Amino acid sequence: MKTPLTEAVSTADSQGRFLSSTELQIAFGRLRQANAGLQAAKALTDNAQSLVNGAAQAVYNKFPYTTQTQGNNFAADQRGKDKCARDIGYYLRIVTYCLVAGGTGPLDEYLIAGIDEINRTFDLSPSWYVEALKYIKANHGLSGDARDEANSYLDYAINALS
Amino acid sequence: MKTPLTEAVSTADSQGRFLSSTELQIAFGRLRQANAGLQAAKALTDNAQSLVNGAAQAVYNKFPYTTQTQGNNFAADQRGKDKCARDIGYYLRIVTYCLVAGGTGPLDEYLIAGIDEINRTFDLSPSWYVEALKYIKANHGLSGDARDEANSYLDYAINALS
Amino acid sequence: MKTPLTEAVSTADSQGRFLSSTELQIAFGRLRQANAGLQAAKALTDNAQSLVNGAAQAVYNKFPYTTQTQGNNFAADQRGKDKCARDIGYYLRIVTYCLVAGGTGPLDEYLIAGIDEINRTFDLSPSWYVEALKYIKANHGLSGDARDEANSYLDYAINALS
Amino acid sequence: MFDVFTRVVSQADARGEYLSGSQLDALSATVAEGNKRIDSVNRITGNASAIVSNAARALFAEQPQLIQPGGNAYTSRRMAACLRDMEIILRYVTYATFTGDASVLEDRCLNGLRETYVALGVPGASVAAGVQKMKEAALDIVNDPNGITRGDCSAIVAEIAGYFDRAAAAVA
Amino acid sequence: MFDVFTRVVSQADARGEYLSGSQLDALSATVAEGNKRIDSVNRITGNASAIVSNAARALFAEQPQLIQPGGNAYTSRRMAACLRDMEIILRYVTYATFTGDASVLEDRCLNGLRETYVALGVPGASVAAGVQKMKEAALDIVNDPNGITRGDCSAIVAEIAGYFDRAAAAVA
Amino acid sequence: MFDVFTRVVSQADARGEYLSGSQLDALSATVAEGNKRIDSVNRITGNASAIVSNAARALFAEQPQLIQPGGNAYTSRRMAACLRDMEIILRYVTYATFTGDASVLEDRCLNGLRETYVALGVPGASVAAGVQKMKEAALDIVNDPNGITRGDCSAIVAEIAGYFDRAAAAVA
Amino acid sequence: MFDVFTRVVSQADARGEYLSGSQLDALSATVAEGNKRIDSVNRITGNASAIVSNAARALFAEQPQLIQPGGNAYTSRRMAACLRDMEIILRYVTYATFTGDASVLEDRCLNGLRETYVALGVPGASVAAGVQKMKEAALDIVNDPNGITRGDCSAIVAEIAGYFDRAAAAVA
Amino acid sequence: TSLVSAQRLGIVAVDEAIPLELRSRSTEEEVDAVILAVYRQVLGNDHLMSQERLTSAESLLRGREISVRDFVRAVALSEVYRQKFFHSNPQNRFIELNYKHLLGRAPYDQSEIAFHTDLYHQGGYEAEINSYIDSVEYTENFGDWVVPYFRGFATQRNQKTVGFSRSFQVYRGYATSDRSGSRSRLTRELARNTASPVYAGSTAESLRGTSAGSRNQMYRLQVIQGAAGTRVRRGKAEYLVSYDNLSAKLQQINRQGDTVTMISLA
Amino acid sequence: LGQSSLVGYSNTQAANRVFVYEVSGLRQTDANENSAHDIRRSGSVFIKVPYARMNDEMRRISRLGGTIVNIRPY
Ligand SMILES: *[C@@H](C)[C@H]1/C(=C/c2[nH]c(/C=C3N=C(/C=C4\NC(=O)C(CC)=C4C)C(C)=C\3CCC(=O)O)c(CCC(=O)O)c2C)NC(=O)[C@@H]1C
Ligand SMILES: *[C@@H](C)[C@H]1/C(=C/c2[nH]c(/C=C3N=C(/C=C4\NC(=O)C(CC)=C4C)C(C)=C\3CCC(=O)O)c(CCC(=O)O)c2C)NC(=O)[C@@H]1C
Ligand SMILES: *[C@@H](C)[C@H]1/C(=C/c2[nH]c(/C=C3N=C(/C=C4\NC(=O)C(CC)=C4C)C(C)=C\3CCC(=O)O)c(CCC(=O)O)c2C)NC(=O)[C@@H]1C
Ligand SMILES: *[C@@H](C)[C@H]1/C(=C/c2[nH]c(/C=C3N=C(/C=C4\NC(=O)C(CC)=C4C)C(C)=C\3CCC(=O)O)c(CCC(=O)O)c2C)NC(=O)[C@@H]1C
Ligand SMILES: *[C@H](C)[C@H]1/C(=C/c2[nH]c(/C=C3N=C(/C=C4\NC(=O)C(CC)=C4C)C(C)=C\3CCC(=O)O)c(CCC(=O)O)c2C)NC(=O)[C@@H]1C
Ligand SMILES: *[C@H](C)[C@H]1/C(=C/c2[nH]c(/C=C3N=C(/C=C4\NC(=O)C(CC)=C4C)C(C)=C\3CCC(=O)O)c(CCC(=O)O)c2C)NC(=O)[C@@H]1C
Ligand SMILES: *[C@H](C)[C@H]1/C(=C/c2[nH]c(/C=C3N=C(/C=C4\NC(=O)C(CC)=C4C)C(C)=C\3CCC(=O)O)c(CCC(=O)O)c2C)NC(=O)[C@@H]1C
Ligand SMILES: *[C@H](C)[C@H]1/C(=C/c2[nH]c(/C=C3N=C(/C=C4\NC(=O)C(CC)=C4C)C(C)=C\3CCC(=O)O)c(CCC(=O)O)c2C)NC(=O)[C@@H]1C
Ligand SMILES: *[C@H](C)[C@H]1/C(=C/c2[nH]c(/C=C3N=C(/C=C4\NC(=O)C(CC)=C4C)C(C)=C\3CCC(=O)O)c(CCC(=O)O)c2C)NC(=O)[C@@H]1C
Ligand SMILES: *[C@H](C)[C@H]1/C(=C/c2[nH]c(/C=C3N=C(/C=C4\NC(=O)C(CC)=C4C)C(C)=C\3CCC(=O)O)c(CCC(=O)O)c2C)NC(=O)[C@@H]1C
Ligand SMILES: *[C@H](C)[C@H]1/C(=C/c2[nH]c(/C=C3N=C(/C=C4\NC(=O)C(CC)=C4C)C(C)=C\3CCC(=O)O)c(CCC(=O)O)c2C)NC(=O)[C@@H]1C
Ligand SMILES: *[C@H](C)[C@H]1/C(=C/c2[nH]c(/C=C3N=C(/C=C4\NC(=O)C(CC)=C4C)C(C)=C\3CCC(=O)O)c(CCC(=O)O)c2C)NC(=O)[C@@H]1C
């Protein structure tokens, strides 16, 4: 999992070196960020139910056929809506992990690695989840460094799906 | 040349990755550090001749035989004293580079790599330079982060010699 | 391209071996198939426009939002409808190459390798193309060996897309 | 590679000189632009896929010879290689922006790239045209005043554009 | 590499066209020749050792300077390397016959062989002569009317001769 | 490899839960200690060569069988290896201190170290004694109150002692 | 590589003839000189560090620009490399002396060395000067009459001097 | 390692091996030696039949048309390598063979297995083989001109300690080969990120005295056990039993439902 | 020569292409500080590369400070 602290050691270790000022600076950079990330995680967590519900609704509005067409990959029944809300919940939850971890590591490990195969195997449009992530970006109400770091992870996912 | 910024890009490049929040945090940690390093660089530069002259004399005091014994590797004549002051000047100047760069890179590139072969070939004792670097740690009059970063580079050089 | 004859030689060459009875049987297997493949190619070629037009309309019928939604990736304007027909024409034309060559070689080389990246980048649903390929399977009118080989290539593409 | 700080160091060591007060002050002025530099890097990165694909769509619309049968970007494999190259070049431009020095772009991306395209028959001039469209999209992204502390980024933007120009010239 | 079929495909794809009726019929004509093609590959392959060994003896008899001390085919390693090269060329000619296209022979065996022999000091002209002797024996073997369903193999024999000529022309 | 933050994250994901309020606040507390952590890492690193050579000297003085002829740290090659190992362990201890999690030390350095030393015939008990010696010196160095903003480093000191203990336990 | 013997054999084989009686006699004279050749190799080898370090010291004193900041032998890595090259050349000179043929020196040391230095910006003329100083000290060491059975070594000294001159010319 | 340990572990010959480099203007003998060394290393020391040699690739190397690294890759991609190590082996056995043959080490962690299984599933055999030879690890240890050699018995930068212990599972002695497919001895310890005791050379030996039965032989049974009788104190156990009691011990272990992981003479 | 072996087993038109890289200036850097083998030539060295490995070799050279001075089709 990529985070500033694990990347610092991995690099130092691959070089067979003690940590130096360069890695200490990496740690300071982590500290400057960490509290804002933790607050971002808390703010997203508290609002998660509303964020997840609004995102699924946003996807259904942008892609009405998903709630009208029969098929295992669509949300025309409650089964599909539950799957969809669950998936969006996964994205949001793992994004909170990235804010806690201070890096995309959690997205890389838990969500992004393999998502292309899943979306093709089960015929899920990546554009659906892009729209959900857009919604969360607009409605999470963060500001400052919390908004910037949270948006970086949301954009990282959007870019991986795009 | 190990610095936070280059190491950040080196790591991302080896992964074929755009820069992410992890690397941005590395940048902030650099920005938090840079001004103290630049101030440390200035203070050391302005006091360079004093620091170098004192460090040289400290070596002569600690190792009196280096001013009494004949031989190319010693400082019994003006030739050897000049060489010796030059060497100490190299350590101090390059240390200032490390403070400017924000990492050991300049010490690694310009001085540390191959130092053992030179000292063995020309029969120069690492202990002489350790003493010189200890003097500089004891007399540069730095405080706070300037002192912390500067001592790390001096200690880095000492450790490489030990 | 991957075809019975080139694969036979490629394998033989890697072993530094003259062609043996095993490769001759591969050639006989190709001959058994060639005429039916050439007949399938001519039949698909002659009805190319009808197949391509029909397949394109089949996609529109099954995915009506493609002709109703504004966007670079959709066929709501003449531009997209022309892109779409071109694309379906590509699938059809390259499939005829496979029948001529006697393998998936042409599909692999010209269409399939990289198709995942194209569809992701340009937000094209692979389900669209699967539907177009199914239409072609249902309307090419082949029978016997010609039908079996053609459908294997259509299914090969379908499997690649899902 | 070099960054903005080590570029100055290497020049000073070649002369055997401490950095002057003017050089330290200039690097201190570099530090003061640091946050804007990070913002520009972050903004380009968060829009990487859109920058590339939009630039690619516009390129192929301007130059339909590239995608018609027989064109250099025809077939999925070549199209994907083309998109990949656009992404690569943008990635290394962000690297140069992040380090504040062109060396990573020149040493690791543009090194032998003109020769690669000639040997392959990639039309280097069309690559340059593509890079230009990514430059124009990227700068507007960096310059967007919405949702960010307001300030003057024209210096960083100018530096970014030079990295795009250097990449464009390297192939064209 | 191309075979007879994919050679036409690649050209058609480059133009974005379906194969014409004329092209398909040409390919159908090739199919009709398939059994003769297979027999010719089998016959050359079954006699490969004799074709090489007889061709080499005949070449060293006409060109004794090759096998005198200091000659290019002198010492066991060079003689063995020379015999290997003859068998390699014959092998790739049978690949080309089998595929019905010269690309395997040209891409893998011949392209660069002239330059390689020049650097080694291998006499390219003598190699061509040996290729000629293998060609003559190989064509006689293909044409042997005994033990095979009688028919006209003139077209396949002309193609095989062309492949030998490419090989000969590529060394000298 | 885990750090203090990702260790908690990984457990949360396995449970399918967001981090609770208290878990985030515990992480806030870890952030509050970050400066002390960095200082500890910086101090051990800065004294690395002395910590190893002092601990090494003391070990061989207490256990002269190690350096006697025929001993396991006798001859230059084995002495060098032994000194290298002490530095290796110290280096991985500082890594664990820096990350706030033992994974780097356990996965990369300690796992298989016992089997390695048993296989080689390196006396693990002796290695453990050396680690204990480095432990005490490092903590004294970390705990030195001179030249540093005064505060309470008891928690960090305990954590670092823990990592040293893991290494001592591992090698026997 | 060749040695003094296999050099004659290889020429003989290309002509397909036995070594003449005078060629065998000449090799016998070479054998009669074997002990002096061994002594010279041993003497240079025994003093290799001194030969290298003294010549290097003499070179930098004669050519101060090399070691000024920005000079080619400035920085430890470059100085280290420079000292290594001196030793490599001296080592290969002794190899040639040991074998009695220059082929080892030319093939494994000097081949490509001028191009290497030109590409690196190493001053080849300064290298040649350092090789001259090594040559001078080596021949004095080889001719040192003390502690060795007395005899005339002028032939071997000339042969060695040639190898040094070969090295110096290859770079300058 | 040093004589004192290498002698016990049966790796003296590995320690004294010298990397073999193909130099400019090499002789015919030196090329021959290099070709032999590549075959020994990449094919895991099988007896190589003359019919299996890569005639053409050998010629190109000898002609300096391709580098040593190219020739290693030619052999790794050959049908000989495939038949020996791929077509009859499970994937994880195939992967550790590639690590031994091409990088001269044992796999460090389960994620290496996962990476290479994914790569094979994605790009097939050629992409899998090329990953080893094109890797940073290959280029920095052997470059283009040095034949690969076993490295697992020496401390490498950026290795895991368990690489040393695991080396003894994939390197079984000088007079051995990877010829019989089979399963990996590393599966469990990779999957669970653990290590196993090194029983190699003469380290498997244990004292007999008067307690080793009629044949004076002890067998070492390594088991994984649980409490499904007397209390179980360790989930991993070893038993030393004489030949005469070996059947009884197996039956005891079997009756308890415990798993035998390894048995060998002691 | 070399194409027969350099081009792998892909049997693709794209992969059936070899290019001769001319590289110069390969020298010691921090990138190859740990490299276990010696650099023998810093002048022009020529490297045959199949199309399928052009990305890798270009990255390897560039990561090692080498300059790609020319690339020629085989
Ligand atoms: C040109 C690039 C645009 C612009 C930039 C700009 N940014 C700031 C200030 C800040 N930007 C950041 C950035 C981040 N904070 C984070 O936590 C992260 C996520 C990892 C990022 C990328 C920060 C920390 C600051 C400083 C605090 C602040 O908000 O002021 C400025 C102000 C000047 C300064 O350099 O500090 C400017 C000008 N502004 C524009 O108008 C351009 C469109
Ligand atoms: C010119 C090449 C000579 C020639 C050839 C020739 N062959 C056939 C017909 C056949 N040859 C085969 C070959 C094989 N059958 C096998 O099982 C194998 C072993 C693996 C081989 C090589 C076959 C199957 C046929 C068809 C059936 C038959 O027995 O004839 C012909 C007839 C035309 C045709 O296309 O079939 C010809 C002309 N004939 C000559 O006179 C040349 C000297
Ligand atoms: C136990 C570890 C000892 C101890 C530590 C301690 N340190 C601080 C505060 C700071 N320490 C640093 C460290 C650095 N600044 C740099 O620029 C670098 C070089 C890369 C380093 C290593 C910093 C930045 C701070 C904050 C500013 C300050 O100077 O105070 C504290 C104070 C509490 C805090 O959390 O910051 C403490 C307690 N103090 C002791 O007495 C122990 C022996
Ligand atoms: C010019 C080179 C100087 C010189 C040389 C010289 N040496 C000998 C004779 C011998 N030298 C040796 C050498 C060795 N014996 C050993 O055991 C080893 C250690 C591995 C070495 C290097 C030997 C064996 C001999 C033969 C016995 C003897 O001592 O005579 C000679 C004498 C003639 C001869 O060719 O043997 C000479 C001339 N003599 C000088 O004056 C030069 C300074
Ligand atoms: C001073 C503490 C003691 C001392 C010094 C001394 N040094 C030399 C010679 C050299 N010193 C260096 C060192 C460097 N060169 C570099 O480029 C750098 C890195 C930037 C360093 C650190 C080198 C390479 C040499 C040899 C070449 C040269 O002379 O420049 C000498 C003379 C040795 C000789 O044989 O000429 C001396 C005297 N000597 C003492 O006694 C002091 C206590
Ligand atoms: C039709 C089923 C649906 C559809 C099609 C559509 N496609 C594009 C754009 C492209 N199509 C391709 C495909 C290929 N290019 C090739 O070379 C080959 C292999 C021979 C294939 C299969 C590509 C690469 C593109 C992008 C580049 C280009 O435009 O040429 C578009 C436009 C996308 C855009 O952003 O411009 C469209 C509309 N769209 C629908 O809605 C149909 C259901
Ligand atoms: C897109 C706008 C244009 C285009 C591109 C195109 N490029 C290639 C092939 C290659 N491009 C590169 C370049 C790089 N690879 C790297 O790793 C980096 C440095 C990190 C760079 C700059 C390389 C090396 C290749 C060849 C190797 C490979 O593709 O894997 C192609 C394919 C050409 C072919 O014949 O296959 C294409 C299509 N083509 C256009 O028409 C656009 C103008
Ligand atoms: C025999 C009729 C003539 C002859 C041949 C000869 N060739 C060589 C050396 C080489 N031949 C090749 C050619 C190839 N190698 C391959 O793998 C392939 C397929 C891609 C071909 C076409 C090569 C590469 C070499 C050089 C490397 C090697 O020796 O194997 C020699 C040896 C020359 C020498 O050893 O110096 C010889 C003798 N020589 C004659 O005189 C005949 C006219
Ligand atoms: C004598 C010339 C000067 C001197 C010696 C001295 N040596 C040490 C310590 C060590 N010496 C060695 C050397 C070896 N160990 C080996 O196994 C072998 C190879 C067979 C050798 C050559 C080692 C490894 C040590 C360190 C460990 C040990 O104590 O054995 C010391 C003490 C250093 C210390 O810190 O304890 C001393 C004093 N010192 C002088 O002043 C003499 C001029
Ligand atoms: C010193 C306190 C004791 C001692 C040490 C000793 N160790 C070895 C050999 C090895 N040590 C290791 C350990 C590691 N290698 C790694 O890469 C890592 C970090 C990831 C570790 C922890 C290994 C693997 C070896 C074996 C391989 C190698 O030696 O390179 C020796 C050498 C034994 C021999 O016979 O050569 C020694 C001497 N010995 C003592 O007596 C001290 C108690
Ligand atoms: C010293 C008298 C002069 C000098 C030397 C110098 N050389 C290099 C770098 C290299 N030298 C070589 C030469 C060889 N490598 C070999 O393996 C062999 C054959 C066995 C030879 C002859 C090479 C290949 C290099 C480059 C790679 C490497 O350094 O290992 C340098 C360093 C150049 C740089 O920029 O780092 C130097 C300084 N320089 C002087 O000024 C003296 C005149
Ligand atoms: C002959 C008297 C008996 C016999 C032998 C036999 N051995 C093998 C296979 C191998 N033999 C070895 C042995 C060595 N390889 C080495 O490198 C060394 C020296 C360090 C030795 C001693 C090896 C490693 C193998 C396996 C590898 C390989 O076979 O290539 C076989 C072949 C078995 C098979 O084909 O499966 C045979 C037949 N067999 C008898 O019946 C005789 C009693």
Residue numbers in the entry:
A (entry chain G), B (entry chain C), C (entry chain E): 1 to 162
D (entry chain D), E (entry chain F), F (entry chain H), G (entry chain B): 1 to 172
H (entry chain c): 2 to 181, 185 to 232, 236 to 273
I (entry chain d): 2 to 75
From the study:
Cyanobacteria use large antenna complexes called phycobilisomes (PBSs) for light harvesting. Using cryo–electron microscopy, we unveiled the OCP-PBS complex structure at 1.6- to 2.1-angstrom resolution, showcasing its inherent flexibility.
We previously proposed that the rods in the PBS are mobile and that they can adopt distinct conformations that control access of OCP to the PBS core. Our flexibility analysis shows that the rods have an inherent propensity to move, in agreement with that hypothesis. In particular, the inherent movement of the PBS rods hints at a conformational switching that controls access of OCP binding to PBS.
